[PDB]
């Protein structure tokens, strides 16, 4: 849904929305074809839906195309510096496409914005909505024909026509940390179709026991999720699906 | 008002290392966008590097590599240090202002640099 | 990269005389180019900055127009010390090259 929300951030007031207690379909996600640019550096698109994390954060932001490129981990620019830095160590990925026909218009594209000065480089994950009137601030004046200081934030130039790279590429970034807590946000999990009176090798939430699995007649408490034997062996589990 | 002045053009050898100078006045380095452009005899202006306000140094296809850059705080004085210099290197380097989307307005008044051996 | 290109690069015109100077870009900038006045044995001065506007300070002889691939340096009263040679850059990019220039001189 934060994909195919309607509102986007500007990249300078980029959105910080965190995700917990759900489930992310990853390998659905890279299936995905709308995508122009699909660049992972934690954890490969592959192996995302096996690996588990505890937090993602999404941060949803409109960037022009060229700027994708500096829109990475260990990158320098503008955009890669003044308004949306990142870690040199990096566990996520990074997804891009192409929007022209979604936000730019015939009239100028104004509701985005972009931190053309600063004084100096933003920390990673770091955002500063302060929209501050003069970056330099030479004189605590704040005269309006300033000399030596500018307005930090300038409206991007986006026009369909031009159709060259300097068109808007709805770039969002994830991060996947490990807090040292329980999970909440973990991969999809593949659940293949049961077979009974066969003996066949199982796994039950962790269960990976062996044996052949029969309809039973014993009936569980509503909680409670695998029987046991006297002696300590397991002989009954409540299928969770 | 405010005024550059450019220094630091004369003789050098191949693979030599000369420190060139610009003086700004009215100008804070730190929060700048100092840039370095050339202009041969005989030609056109041509970008040579560009240093941002925090860092983040730019460099041209053709010097990149060879030269560094590495603006001084002391007061606001703009440096531009070279590194193997070649014969065709030699131009009237130019200073350069804050703005990059608004507009350059100002230059460094620009000296020669002789390069041959 | 991004290349940009001025024709015919060398013009003759008389005082009072309109002169269209056109910077062509090989690749789209959008209307991210910007004007210069390299008088010489001088610095260059510029005149138009980003879309079509008035840089403060130049005299109001000075318009532009066109967007994209296209522009269009446009003096209405040539002035006699306004020949020198104009240089074309694309303002909103990393790498900022200049055109190929243009030169002014006494029909």
């Known amino acids: 849904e934060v994909f195919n929300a309607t509102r986007f951030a500007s990249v300078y007031a980029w959105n910080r929305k965190r995700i917990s207690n759900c489930v992310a379909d990853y390998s659905v996600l890279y299936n995905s074809a709308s995508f122009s640019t699909f660049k992972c550096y934690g954890v490969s698109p592959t192996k995302l839906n096996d690996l588990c994390f505890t937090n993602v954060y999404a941060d949803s932001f409109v960037i022009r195309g060229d700027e994708v490129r500096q829109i990475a981990p260990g990158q320098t620019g503008k955009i890669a510096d003044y308004n949306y830095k990142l870690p040199d160590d990096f566990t996520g990925c990074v997804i891009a496409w192409n929007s022209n026909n979604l936000d730019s218009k015939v009239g100028g594209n104004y509701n985005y914005l972009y931190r053309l000065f600063r004084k100096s480089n933003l920390k990673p994950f770091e955002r500063d909505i302060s929209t501050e009137i003069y970056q330099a601030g030479s004189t605590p004046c704040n005269g309006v024909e300033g000399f030596n200081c500018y307005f930090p934030l300038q409206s991007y130039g986006f026009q369909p026509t031009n159709g060259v790279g300097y068109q808007p590429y709805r770039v969002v970034v994830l991060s996947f940390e490990l807090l040292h807590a329980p999970a909440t946000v973990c991969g999809p999990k593949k659940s293949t179709n049961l077979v009974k009176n066969k003996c066949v090798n199982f796994n039950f939430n962790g269960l990976t026991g062996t044996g052949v699995l029969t309809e039973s007649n014993k009936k569980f408490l509503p909680f409670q999720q695998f029987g046991r034997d006297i002696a300590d062996t397991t002989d009954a589990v409540r299928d969770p699906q | 008002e405010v005024q550059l002045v450019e220094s630091g053009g004369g003789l050098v050898q191949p693979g030599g290392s000369l420190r060139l100078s610009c003086a700004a006045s009215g100008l804070t380095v730190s929060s700048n966008y100092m840039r370095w452009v050339r202009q041969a005899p005989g030609k056109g202006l041509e970008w040579v590097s560009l240093?941002?306000?925090?860092?983040?140094?730019f460099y041209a296809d053709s010097v990149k590599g060879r030269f560094i850059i590495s603006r001084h705080n002391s007061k606001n004085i703009l440096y531009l240090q070279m590194n193997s210099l070649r014969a065709e290197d030699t131009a009237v380097y130019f200073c350069?202002?804050?703005?990059?989307?608004?507009?350059?307005?100002?230059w460094g008044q620009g000296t020669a640099v002789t390069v041959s051996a | 990269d991004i290349q940009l290109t001025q024709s015919p690069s060398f013009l003759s015109a008389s005082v009072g005389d309109r002169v269209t100077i056109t910077c062509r870009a090989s690749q789209g900038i959008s209307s991210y180019l910007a004007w210069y006045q390299q008088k010489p044995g001088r610095a260059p001065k510029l005149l138009i900055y980003?879309?079509?506007t008035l840089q403060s300070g130049v005299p109001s002889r000075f318009s532009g127009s066109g967007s994209g691939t296209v522009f269009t340096l446009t003096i209405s009263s040539l002035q006699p010390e306004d020949f020198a040679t104009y240089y074309c850059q694309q303002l909103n990019s990393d790498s900022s090259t200049f055109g190929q220039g243009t030169k002014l001189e006494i029909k």
């Open positions: 350069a202002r804050d703005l990059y989307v608004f507009g350059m307005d100002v």
């Open positions: 240093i941002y306000a925090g860092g983040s140094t």
């Open positions: 980003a879309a079509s």
